């Protein structure tokens, strides 16, 4: 079975965010454990929420009181509504499933993980610019001045995967994130093959496809 | 329940053995068994379950992983080292609440020195109309991370107004990639012609620099 | 910085467990920031002869290593003497002892649900058998945390001065079919770290069995008795049950013989069933059903074939 | 330069106790730097390097490669033969070790199979010795007084430190039927003794084997045949499959060992898979049972067609 | 199964010839095992004298060598032993024996055997004088040579060895206990003198 | 090669350990194999083979027997003594022709002591006319065999005229039998009126005699 999350994005401080997790393959009412795990940016992981098939819940001491978690049997999906969001509350939330062992659990299946960034800054879409160029050539795309993370980048709708280097984003002087993505291809395939990078920024509903052709 | 691991970052040769120690302030030996878990978080993906109860391996996990210990101290052992194991490793306890994860251990690989690849990317004509200029300097597939990049616009050394970023090690060859970005005002690009990027690295006995002229 | 560590190793034996004529012990002082170091060997507390041990110090990078080898005869090493290696590191002395390697072994078997108990009877049961215990608490568990049906713990000592604990745990029908996992652990006063026995569904795929039933011809001198051979092959996994039926009633297991499941030449396992019948049975009704119960069969996990 | 193999292990406790995990180190002394392959063998089976660590060190001109194997405390108590196999430049270098006394030397006299007796026309008795410690000449004897045919001698050393003696004597067919008894003894340089085992025709009444050949029905270039040989005493029997007037190999068909029937006698099943090109060349597959009680030529067989 | 029975005994004059016979039933000799004769003197030990193998190879003993010879017959399924120049040492009880090979031999199956008397005395018969009585019996006085079979009509009986009287003749006695209307009859059969005596004992 | 058995004869209670020794003059073994056998010779029949190679037992031989030794010294050991296995046992070497046998070891079975029952019967009416008068003093079911019967002809000591005959252990009463036969001339039988034999035995407190009138 697989665990897929949904409902992330940008939320103002102290607001309410509802994170969902649609399971697939196993009925959520057949008997298992379903937990929520968060990870601070650059720090370790931390558990917060848990729910069983019959309805027993528990809450971590560091986040108890600000969290509301419930289940829905009709859609095989359980939610996590959370209020009183703080600056130290920004973390990547993972929808995970545990297995029983004499009263002790361990997360076996892990979700894809959704990033929730709690801040007061407004959303900003990225501007995409190409990077045009021995025996091996280099080309790429630029993702500059945007907020917040994350950004998914692919090439030729997924046709080019070997030699792809997506550099992690950096915080520019203006407080926005900037990201570079390049790919190395042989110099013979410059004038023959077409190269297009796919950029998608879900928090701002921005989908851009910019073509890179050599400059001579 | 504070947990700690050691060491933080280590460089090991291909095929060696790795030892990680999850030290706990809580004796978890109860009911004749020990309750301690291990995890592998691949860079930028969901953590992967490895060992449960610090002794039994997860069904489907290769035999290179082997866990030991009981009570307060635990030890992790890697039989043969493959490049597929570049990740950060955390230990999670389920004995008593609150459930706590370790501090993490970024295990990177030592190997033979690889020559870097230097590339320079001019700011596209679209970005010039946007009022900002960004010359991109690229380093591709090399080792180690220890490198120095110096910017030079019209043979004039630049500093302070540049931003660099490094990637994670490859699952195939365990190399690094570096991207250097230049940030200047629009009038500075329109006033200079020769742009170059010099990099210092132990892989090459002589540093390399590539240059070009704008509008050419 | 890093303080040194001490470890002791001995010479290996042969395939017949024979010790070499000269036994050699090694005292490792590895991984320490370079500093003053001196090794001293002991025999039951007494400092041994300085000419019997040699010490070599190697420095690598930021850590240092020190090796000390001691050659002894088999008669001296077999004396069960406590040989202590005392290594001093700038005033901090580390010690470690060794002696010649001078009970009973515990084992446990956890059976899987038989095809008869799960599909025909409808009351599947597993058996967590633990043997060879020193005569002086059982703890079951489940993987999904579902309500565990309790088990009967039958603790009985054995004739070889040991103890046996049989635990039969009733399980559900749909649970094992849908791949439920169960675990078994026993606790004893002398246990520092108990063991675990976990049973689950087979890792391999499923394949329905093919049943062919043949009747042996009358052999000269045996006109009142026929032999019925039944071939059941190409089923995965090998867990299968076989029973015979005549006159719509099932025959006991003592009347038929079934071999162990063995691999075929490609994929699947094969078994052979042999039933001996009398002339009063086939003249009553000339039809004998060779029924095979397998988890991969359907709808009711049953496949059969009759022979005349 | 050939390398030197040497095995070490973890030291036991001062009170005669075993550590929780016994580790075996296999040191390779100085040798010319080249391809070295440290394969760990447990009772002659290959171990995966995903459990044993490999470490190579080269100083000046000599190389030093060491492999460490991690084992549990229970596995070292199994008295299994562990082996560190090292291959260099083609020639192999093997060093074995086991857990660590007097113990008895045993031997068994093997009965000649009816295949060698009635079919191969070379009935061979085998006097096998096991668990021997270092000429080792073997001598046979008959009870009737007639001289024995000279037997081939074969010495064979095992990884468990034992030495085995293989003696194959071509016997007469009429002698084994009449009730000839053969014996065996070995003069060993280690112990001043010489043991003896004896073989003969199995006593008790005899039941002729019943052969039945069947064929699975054709269901939508391969057919499966079955053969039932049952109700024979004693259990000494040999099963073969004949096709195109040529005996089929033993590894082709699966045959079970003799097992007691519900009453008197033993029963044996046999399974053989034939291709389409076989019964097109000759649609006749014969399941022949070789038993001493069968008549007239100690042979009973049945033919089946598909 | 396979049994061996010997024959060819009785009173023999000194210095004469003794022809012994032992019939083999159950197995052959040409393709069989080893066959030999074993004799024992009256009240002494056993001494191997003659032997023959399956192929006919013979081996003898030096104590009676040159005056003994063992042969065989293919049609009678038997073998024979011939002795000459019998001295008083050669008077013995000859047994028929069959051996089995071991790399070294040992006799597994034996024969009943026969007794041969070599002397210059004549064949005297058993004078049967009954003994009136509880117990009763028949006395056997002055006979030659041995042996004598004394049958009855067996339970609670005891047959004594014959005393060697100075006259060269032997005298034995036989007793049996009876509870204190039935008539008891003793059957004394003499092998050399072919004499059978029926004697009824009356109170 | 000559064999010296040790001892020459012995007796033991029911269910005891029987040990027989046999000394060989030369080494009868070769290549380690012990080359010597053992036999059982019971009266009234033919001898029967026990074991071979001084240790290996044949089929149909009681498992209670056991052999040990090598080279020159050999030992025969019986686990427990049965009341139906009394016989004389011999050692025999097979290293060099001719084969030789031992001195012989008689094994006697022991039981309880019983007093002798003696009945005296004179020569019959048909024996007196035969010139020889044979008087028999018969004793049955007595134990042990060590006993003495003294002849008294007209109360006078008779010496040198007694022919004593002894029987071996019986298979029904497990006792011995002795017969004292007195050979006297026909002229001597008439010169006496009262005859008597005094049977002295351990089962009798005082020597019991039996008398009859001619
Ligand atoms: C003191 O004495 C006791 C009594 O003998 C010993 O306890 C026995 O221990 C042995 C082995 O330790 C046990 O044997 C095991 O029995 C299992 C029972 O399985 C049943 O169900 C299966 C279902 O398929 C049937 O096939 C099977 O026939 C049984 O009916 C077996 O499953 C085990 O098999 C395993 O090992 C064999 C080894 O050949 C493999 O072939 C198998 O594939 C499988 O891996 C095993 O045979 C026995 O049951 C115990 N008896 C009792 C009464 O408990 C103690 O060990 C002993 N102690 C000491 C110190 O000596
Ligand atoms: C050191 O390693 C050596 C390996 O060479 C061991 O020697 C083996 O010892 C075992 C003893 O169990 C031998 O097994 C015996 O084989 C006899 C002959 O069988 C032949 O035929 C079969 C096929 O029918 C072949 O597979 C087999 O290899 C032979 O060619 C059997 O007759 C024996 O059965 C007897 O013993 C068993 C014991 O369980 C009884 O159950 C039986 O009823 C019967 O009495 C037995 O199976 C084996 O053959 C030896 N190896 C070789 C190569 O021949 C040493 O034992 C080992 N020593 C130590 C101390 O570890």
Author numbering:
A (entry chain H): 2 to 134, 141 to 223
B (entry chain L): 2 to 217
C (entry chain A): 229 to 253, 253A, 254 to 329, 333 to 366, 371 to 542
D (entry chain B): 230 to 253, 253A, 254 to 328, 332 to 365, 369 to 454, 458 to 543
E (entry chain I): 1 to 103, 105 to 134, 144 to 163, 168 to 194, 199 to 221
F (entry chain M): 2 to 215
From the paper:
Immunoglobulin E (IgE) antibodies play a crucial role in allergic disease, binding to allergens through their Fab arms and expressing their effector functions by binding to receptors for the Fc region. The Fc region of IgE comprises a disulfide-linked dimer of three domains: Cϵ2, Cϵ3, and Cϵ4. Omalizumab is an anti-IgE monoclonal IgG1 antibody that is approved for therapeutic use (Xolair®, Novartis). It binds to free IgE and inhibits both FcϵRI and CD23 binding.
We report the structure, at 3.7 Å resolution, of the complex between IgE-Fc and a Fab fragment derived from the therapeutic anti-IgE antibody omalizumab; we call this Fab fragment, which contains three point mutations in framework regions distal to the antigen-binding site, FabXol3. We designed a Fab, derived from omalizumab, with three point mutations, two in the VL domain framework region (S81R and Q83R) and one in the Cκ domain (L158P), with the purpose of disrupting favorable crystal contacts observed in the omalizumab Fab crystal structure. Two FabXol3 molecules (Fab1 and Fab2) bind to an asymmetric, partially bent IgE-Fc molecule, and the Fab engages one edge of the exposed face of each Cϵ3 domain. Each FabXol3 molecule engages one edge of the exposed face of the Cϵ3 domain (C, C′, F, and G strands and base of the FcϵRI receptor-binding FG loop). The interface with IgE-Fc is similar to that reported for the constrained Fcϵ3–4 molecule. Both the heavy and light chain of FabXol3 are involved, the former contributing ∼60% to an interface area of ∼715 Å2. Phe-103 is mostly buried in a pocket created by Thr-373, the Trp-374 main chain, Ser-375, Gln-417, and Arg-419 (Cϵ3), and it forms a cation/π-stacking interaction with Arg-419. In contrast to the aϵFab complex, in which IgE-Fc adopts a fully extended, linear conformation, IgE-Fc adopts a partially bent conformation in the FabXol3 complex. The site to which Fab1 binds is exposed in free, acutely bent IgE-Fc, but further unbending of IgE-Fc, to just over 90°, is required to render the site occupied by Fab2 accessible. This unbending of IgE-Fc in the FabXol3 complex is associated with opening of both Cϵ3 domains to create an almost symmetrical Fcϵ3–4 region. In the FabXol3/IgE-Fc complex, the Cϵ3 domains are positioned further away from one another than in any other crystal structure containing IgE-Fc or Fcϵ3–4 and thus adopt the most open conformation observed thus far; this conformation is significantly more open than the conformation for FcϵRI-bound IgE-Fc. However, in the FabXol3/IgE-Fc complex, the Cϵ3 domains adopt a conformation that is more open than in FcϵRI-bound IgE-Fc, which precludes simultaneous engagement of both chains.
